[PDB]
Amino acid sequence: AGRQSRTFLVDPNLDLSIRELVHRILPVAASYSAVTRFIEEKSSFEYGQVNHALAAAMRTLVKEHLILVSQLEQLHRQGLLSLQKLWFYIQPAMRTMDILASLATSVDKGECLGGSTLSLLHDRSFSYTGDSQ
Amino acid sequence: MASSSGAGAAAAAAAANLNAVRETMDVLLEISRILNTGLDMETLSICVRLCEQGINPEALSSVIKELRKATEALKAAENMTS
Amino acid sequence: TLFLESVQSRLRTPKENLMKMQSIAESHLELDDVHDPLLA
Amino acid sequence: RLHQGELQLLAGGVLQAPQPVLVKECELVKDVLNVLIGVVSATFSLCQPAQAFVVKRGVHVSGASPESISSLLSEVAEYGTCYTRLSHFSLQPVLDSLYSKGLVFQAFTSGLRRYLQYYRACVLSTPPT
Amino acid sequence: MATPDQKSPNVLLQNLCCRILGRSEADVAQQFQYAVRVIGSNFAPTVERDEFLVAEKIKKELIRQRREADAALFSELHRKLHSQGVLKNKWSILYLLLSLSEDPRRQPSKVSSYATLFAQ
């Protein structure tokens, strides 16, 4: 619904610990989907060169994220990933995706475009004074 | 969310009452031993349950004496047959 | 102690933990989480 | 079982001792690991307001008394409760515009998240054997 | 709340007889009948129905048996039992315990095998 993170329904017959881990990781997947959607839409020329370039950089980072996710899938195929190991490995990805989703949502709420997109990015960078990444 | 915490406390209170009862039963067993009553843990527990039910101590004592004589005759027969 | 040693002798009578923690973290911590050395 | 029956006979039926449910240890270890992650198990249920595991009454373990096993499991459940509640307290995630604790508190919570990550790593490092 | 199936006094007495004799319930049928006859007989009221009076009588009896330490221990245990309040009929249990006390000093009068003749 709107520029919100995707919500997920988990099968109720799953193990409570598995279901909770899924619900904890799904926020990262929703944030990734939102960031990728913003990157792919705002990369159009109509969004202006500043917003287009920001979206393009986000798209490149989304591609790197997809590579990372494929590597995590491969690790899963090897059976070397436990639920605690999975949670730990997604924790950095969860935080990065949450930061990206917060930036996307800030641009979307401000309808930031071009120079306004640059303003939103600057304001987010000031908002991330505690988050070096 | 609150309700789940109460059942643990209720269970703990019930367990504490049971432990107090167990302690009392151990005290009674010790008293019986000091009194040389001859009751074993199973026999003492049975006697405690029977006493809780109101049995007259004079009748109970006479019954115990007769049962002890019969048990002694049966134990002597069992030891002679082995 | 000197007496016991002399009697036996005459009678012919009778950082590594940090490295382990780092290996444990590498085996169980996600690559991106910086180990905190005081916490480690 | 004999001793518990004797205790029930002495208690004259008033002490409704919870029926000892014999569970295999190779399962109790799983419940313990779940507690280490704050996860409720078949023997331990999570009291949501306390974020605490509650032991199922009448847990029997082979080779130990169900009361003593229940005591040990109660201590373990208390440890799991502490882990889960501490995680929830530290889990206050985002310095959203409603975050009034400031950046020093936010950084503290980030360090606490790192600590809890290390704790989770240790828990996962615990061999189930 | 289904108060544990406290089997009727007859069944409890049968279980007690089986435990005391070390035989199955089926082997104690004559003893069970004897027990039923005894239990159905009118018994005189106990000499003392006061918990503290019963404890004092027990202490005096132990002193008469030259068991003064046992008398003190009995008085202490009786005080503890009275304070615990778990037993509903303290006087009855005290009377039972007094009736079941045995003097260690009196050499057991070995029951002549002849007593078995009346057991049948």
TrEMBL record, chain D:
Location in or out of the cell: Cytoplasm, Cytoskeleton, Microtubule organizing center, Centrosome
Source taxon at top rank: Eukaryota
Function as written in the Swiss-Prot or TrEMBL entry: Component of the gamma-tubulin ring complex (gTuRC) which mediates microtubule nucleation. The gTuRC regulates the minus-end nucleation of alpha-beta tubulin heterodimers that grow into microtubule protafilaments, a critical step in centrosome duplication and spindle formation.
Family of this protein: Belongs to the TUBGCP family.
Oligomeric form and interacting partners: Component of the gamma-tubulin ring complex (gTuRC) consisting of TUBGCP2, TUBGCP3, TUBGCP4, TUBGCP5 and TUBGCP6 and gamma-tubulin TUBG1 or TUBG2. TUBGCP2, TUBGCP3, TUBGCP4, TUBGCP5 and TUBGCP6 assemble in a 5:5:2:1:1 stoichiometry; each is associated with a gamma-tubulin, thereby arranging 14 gamma-tubulins in a helical manner. Gamma-tubulin at the first position is blocked by TUBGCP3 at the last position, allowing 13 protafilaments to grow into a microtubule.
Protein name, entry field: Gamma-tubulin complex component 6
The gene coding this protein: TUBGCP6
Whole-protein residues included: 325 to 453 of 1811
